[PDB]
Design a binder for this molecule. Structure first.
Ligand SMILES: [Mg+2]
Ligand SMILES: [Mg+2]
Ligand SMILES: [Mg+2]
Ligand SMILES: [Mg+2]
Ligand SMILES: [Mg+2]
Ligand SMILES: [Mg+2]
Ligand SMILES: [Mg+2]
Ligand SMILES: [Mg+2]
Ligand SMILES: [Mg+2]
Ligand SMILES: [Mg+2]
Ligand SMILES: [Mg+2]
Ligand SMILES: [Mg+2]
Ligand SMILES: [Mg+2]
Ligand SMILES: [Mg+2]
Ligand SMILES: [Mg+2]
Ligand SMILES: [Mg+2]
Ligand SMILES: [Mg+2]
Ligand SMILES: [Mg+2]
Ligand SMILES: [Mg+2]
Ligand SMILES: [Mg+2]
Ligand SMILES: [Mg+2]
Ligand SMILES: [Mg+2]
Ligand SMILES: [Mg+2]
Ligand SMILES: [Mg+2]
Ligand SMILES: [Mg+2]
Ligand SMILES: [Mg+2]
Ligand SMILES: [Mg+2]
Ligand SMILES: [Mg+2]
Ligand SMILES: [Mg+2]
Ligand SMILES: [Mg+2]
Ligand SMILES: [Mg+2]
Ligand SMILES: [Mg+2]
Ligand SMILES: [Mg+2]
Ligand SMILES: [Mg+2]
Ligand SMILES: [Mg+2]
Ligand SMILES: [Mg+2]
Ligand SMILES: [Mg+2]
Ligand SMILES: [Mg+2]
Ligand SMILES: [Mg+2]
Ligand SMILES: [Mg+2]
Lengths: 150, 129, 145
RNA sequence: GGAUAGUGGCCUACCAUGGUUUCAACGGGUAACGGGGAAUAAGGGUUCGAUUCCGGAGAGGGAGCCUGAGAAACGGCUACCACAUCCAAGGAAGGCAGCAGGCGCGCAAAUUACCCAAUCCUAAUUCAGGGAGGUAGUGACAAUAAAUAACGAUACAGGGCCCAUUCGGGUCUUGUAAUUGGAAUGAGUACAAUGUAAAUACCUUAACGAGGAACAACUGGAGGGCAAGUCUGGUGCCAGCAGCCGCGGUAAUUCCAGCUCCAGUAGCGUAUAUUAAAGUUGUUGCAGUUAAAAAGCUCGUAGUUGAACUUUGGGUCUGGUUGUCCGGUCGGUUUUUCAACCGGAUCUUUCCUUCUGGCUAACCUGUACUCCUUGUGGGUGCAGGCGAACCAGGACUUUUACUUUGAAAAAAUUAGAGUGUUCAAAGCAGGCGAAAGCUCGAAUAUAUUAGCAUGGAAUAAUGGAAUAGGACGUUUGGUUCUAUUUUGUUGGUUUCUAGGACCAUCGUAAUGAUUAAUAGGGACGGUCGGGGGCAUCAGUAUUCAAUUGUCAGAGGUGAAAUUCUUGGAUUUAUUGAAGACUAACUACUGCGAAAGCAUUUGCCAAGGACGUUUUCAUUAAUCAAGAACGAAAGUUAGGGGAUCGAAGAUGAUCAGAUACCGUCGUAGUCUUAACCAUAAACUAUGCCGACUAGGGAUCGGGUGGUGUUUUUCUUAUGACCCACUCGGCACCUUACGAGAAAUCAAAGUCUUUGGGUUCUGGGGGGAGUAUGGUCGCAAGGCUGAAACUUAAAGGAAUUG
RNA sequence: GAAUCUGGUCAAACUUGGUCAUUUAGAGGAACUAAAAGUCGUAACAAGGUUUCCGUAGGUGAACCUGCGGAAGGAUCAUUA
């Protein structure tokens, strides 16, 4: 029922019956794979990619048409970034609150949230470290996190 | 989180059977559920049941018979040492006479009478009476 | 509801530490674990206590009833503590007399006041080696003075 | 290295900086020796274990050691302390926590008895010894077994009744009488002999031994709890009983005495523990809206818990195991007509770990083909060769939990089989002959914690191929080997080769990722908000002051007063400053983790829901430690101070009133920089999770309506109607569900007790105190006692 | 092969301090509890005669009062346009 707030939504994508393709929506596995790896070199993330693939072009899922997911495509071509997609988007937000707090000493409910986002990261990092994506004995935080971003 | 699906399922059953619904829906739907239900079918606490494949997780439709009274679940799956079955079934079911204690084991998911014939115990799941 | 307490197959410790540390609000268990009996409770956590009649008191009782109760302040031998013992039966503090060795008993209530005698937790039994009931009923006689 | 019998930080040198810890290290406590066990006794348990067995310690303490196989012995020694003996003062001797005894302590516990005959033990040992051990004494520790009359007759009453014109015999059976009478009995003594080491006592008896006076049952109780006195005398709120309730002021059923009577009975009471009762400690199994009890809120590490998914199904035979079908039989037994049930072998896209070899049992065989009913009934029989019929060695095992039967868990205990100790409690005895010799026994079970054994593969975890450095092998090269066996035997060097190991390259295979949880995160989209920070705008308000104007009061009043100016205060109007607030809308509305948040725009980041054929793929829920915020008040330190306004003054009232009201009015209020960290921070309802019932609404999202109206002609937005939907906030009725009820659709799905997790409570007080932490500038917080005290404190409802 | 004796070593105990724990006199203080029942009021319970409460400051002769904020366990589930 959400991680942090007390709001219990099911804002959700459904996923249709067919693991198989919706045949008529054409293209190819390789053509879509080449389509993807352009966007992986343009800097766009799996989540952005798959929106672009879906919205304009005829893809439903890369999972469907290619067999591989997307990150799994990108990894196979060496275009997945060091710091994972999701974590990176939190590490960005962290910085964008740590920055806002440095200016605003007196601002409590942002300090509150910053303590959330920080914690959310250490949930995800601690996940990723145990997967063996990020190397362990490596903490993803605040001072050096600004450098990890840029 | 949704923890013991089996329980969370059997709870819906127990609510359904209480009101006298002729059927129930059960979201998550496992092996254990189905081998648990299968057991209820072999004794006759349960009618047909129809395992939907969401191209996904599970989902079941049970047909209740008006025969279930309680579709018990005991919660931390206690290991049972063969003689200790008698103490579980004594403390869970009404009477030496009739009832079943659905226990997973080496043999699969038996009831406590079948598990005595076989001479093979294990963990408990639930019961029916 | 989950019903408060944990239920894991590996909980145990969070049961067994919880039940150590709730028990402590069970007044039976607290006296046993903290030796109130020994460290306090005039008698040394003991059935009885011989103690010298320091004076024959009359104790005016609590309300509803009204009677002066005819007791004895004692000096418990072993501990050197002073207590107040009741003397059962018609007179019979007459039979107790003064500066006698008096064997005491708990009144019944595991400490505490027996009924209306406010601040008396003990019954005399043996006065200088007899038994008050044996005197009172006069089946036995006192060993002279 | 040293030592030790020996391993070792056991000791020493030199070196390194480890080791344990919230899965409670360390410390403290223990009225703690451990275990076997004990009591309790549905199940789960609790408490106890000094104490008959097994370990361990100790011999007043603490040391040190001799001898010795074995001693850090103490019925050995050395010493020092502590205690004490014997003295001719120079010096000697000591150690009961062996037995007996005594003191002392204490509520609390035995005789300085007789013995080695048993049981065993020791030695130079048949022969000696043994307070080890037995034998008594004492012994209401426990426990076992059971006398305290029985049968008559006569004499007075109850019950059946042959019949009941009134009786009554009483033919038949029961109870009462200091009648009376016959018949036993060990309680005792005592020759004897048993018994016994000798005795006692027991079992056995020569001889005596019962008549109500003897050869005598007490304890407690007699209103309720709780079995049973409204008997007789006293007593008279006393004296007393009374676990609790409570009784007692002249008929007290509770005190105290007689007779009745009850309960238990050679026992029963009392006290303290303790177990049960106590589901009042709760794992099973409690409570927390209000009764005690949900941390103010969120985060959060450990913990604990954690969606679903991978081998299912069908056949084919083949072993049992009881009901059946008759007893086919001399109340028992062997098959079939049949059964369910439990296996086993397999075959099904299927390996059960695989080989280097031993044994290949067997025929898949067919080498001569026939001992022979016309035959595929039957076997002397050995080159290719089915290996499961076993070994005996590799190779290397994903590992656990879980469960199985097994091996082990000393005996006594515990349950329990066998058995005439007279019965038992027990004990390991016993049983049957010619009664010349023979002969059954002395079980079985438990104890589940850990380890070991083997099966099982559900459950749960864990693991493997996604840089494949992956898997195999007719690879073909290689690279590093290792290395024994023959070349006569040693030292080589290189082979052939067979085993490692390691990069290549050629092939083989279906080459290798499960979902994508109405889990979660994260991306995107449009939105939404009185969410927060920082910045501005207003209203308009109150205040003072200004200038302005107008000449008696204006304020206040709670009913009523005081109190203020007039040299127009007030009132009227224009402003100014300051620092406040930020109405009306404003709601069973919104947002916020809470606390809390409404004038404005702007900026700053954040956020929920929503939608989503987006992406990761277990990241998740709750959480002791730790944190973040956290109303008001308070506090330092600043700014301001309009009004109210803790303090104060002060005016009335009342028996009085430093209390309301009255009037004024520092501190504050407000703000800024610090702290504080609590509130009825209250929905007095922890969080997550699912599922149960309708009604209609209610709102923030979203669908569909040739719907209506807007009207700028079709409109298209907007705004409704109506139906259904995800999200939010609350009501109505029945409750068949809950609940003590009030009530509650959650406080339901709970004695038909188990989804996950955190926390809190265990009569009331004493007390949120004492103390100690710890935190604070302090106030205070957090943490948190008992002694003592008390029978009720509550809660909810009913009638008054 | 004795007494004797030079280093070690084990280390009682004493000496004179230091330190934890448990006990235990203690003048005094300051409590808290029982109460026969006395003074002073009469706070709360009825809108308890200023509605109760809570938090928190100040003050008092005592209950108590008064700010501020909060809560109804309130003396109200109610004013529509
Ligand atoms: Mg949800
Ligand atoms: Mg969370
Ligand atoms: Mg009185
Ligand atoms: Mg060495
Ligand atoms: Mg001890
Ligand atoms: Mg013990
Ligand atoms: Mg012992
Ligand atoms: Mg002792
Ligand atoms: Mg011993
Ligand atoms: Mg001694
Ligand atoms: Mg010694
Ligand atoms: Mg000895
Ligand atoms: Mg000795
Ligand atoms: Mg002795
Ligand atoms: Mg005794
Ligand atoms: Mg002895
Ligand atoms: Mg005797
Ligand atoms: Mg006799
Ligand atoms: Mg009597
Ligand atoms: Mg009487
Ligand atoms: Mg009665
Ligand atoms: Mg009596
Ligand atoms: Mg108990
Ligand atoms: Mg309770
Ligand atoms: Mg409460
Ligand atoms: Mg699972
Ligand atoms: Mg027995
Ligand atoms: Mg003014
Ligand atoms: Mg609004
Ligand atoms: Mg406004
Ligand atoms: Mg905490
Ligand atoms: Mg404030
Ligand atoms: Mg005042
Ligand atoms: Mg609090
Ligand atoms: Mg609370
Ligand atoms: Mg208490
Ligand atoms: Mg020396
Ligand atoms: Mg009023
Ligand atoms: Mg009053
Ligand atoms: Mg009042």
């Amino acid at each position: 029922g959400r991680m942090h707030s007390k709001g219990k939504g099911m804002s959700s994508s459904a996923i249709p019956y067919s693991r198989n393709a919706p045949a008529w929506f054409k293209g190819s596995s390789d053509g879509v794979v080449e389509q993807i790896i352009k966007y992986a070199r343009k800097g766009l993330t799996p989540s952005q990619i798959g929106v672009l693939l879906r919205d304009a072009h005829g893809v439903t899922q890369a999972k469907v048409i290619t067999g591989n997911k997307i990150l799994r495509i990108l990894k196979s071509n060496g275009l997945a970034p060091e710091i994972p997609e999701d974590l990176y988007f939190l590490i960005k937000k962290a910085v964008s609150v740590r920055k806002h707090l440095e200016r605003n000493r007196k601002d409590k409910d942002a300090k509150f949230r910053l303590i959330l986002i920080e914690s959310r990261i250490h949930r995800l990092a601690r996940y990723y470290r145990t997967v063996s994506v990020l190397p362990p004995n490596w903490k993803y935080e605040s001072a050096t996190a600004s450098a990890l971003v840029n | 989180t949704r923890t013991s699906v089996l329980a969370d399922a059997l709870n819906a059953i127990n609510n359904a059977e209480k009101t006298g619904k002729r059927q129930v829906l059960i979201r998550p739907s496992s092996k254990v559920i189905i081998k648990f239900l299968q057991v209820m079918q072999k004794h006759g606490y349960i009618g047909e049941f129809e395992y939907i494949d969401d191209h996904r997780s599970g989902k079941i439709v049970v047909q209740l018979n008006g025969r279930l009274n309680k579709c018990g679940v005991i919660s931390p799956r206690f290991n049972v040492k063969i003689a200790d079955v008698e103490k579980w079934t004594a403390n869970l079911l009404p009477a030496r006479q009739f009832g079943y204690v659905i226990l997973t084991t080496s043999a699969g998911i038996m009831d406590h009478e079948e598990a005595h014939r076989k001479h093979v115990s294990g963990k408990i799941l639930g019961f029916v009476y | 509801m989950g019903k408060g307490k944990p239920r894991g197959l590996n909980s145990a410790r969070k049961l067994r530490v919880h039940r150590r540390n709730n028990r402590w609000a069970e007044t039976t268990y607290k006296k046993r674990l903290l030796g109130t009996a020994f460290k306090s409770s005039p008698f040394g956590g003991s059935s009885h206590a011989k103690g010298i009649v320091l004076e024959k008191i009359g104790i005016e009782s609590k309300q509803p009833n009204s009677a002066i109760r005819k007791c004895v302040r004692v000096q418990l031998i072993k501990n050197g503590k002073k207590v107040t013992a009741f003397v059962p039966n018609d007179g019979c503090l007459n039979f107790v007399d003064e500066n006698d060795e008096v064997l005491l008993a708990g009144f019944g209530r595991k400490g505490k006041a027996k009924g209306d005698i406010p601040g008396v937790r003990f019954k005399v039994v043996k006065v200088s080696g007899v038994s008050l009931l044996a005197l009172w009923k006069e089946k036995k006689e006192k060993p002279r003075s």
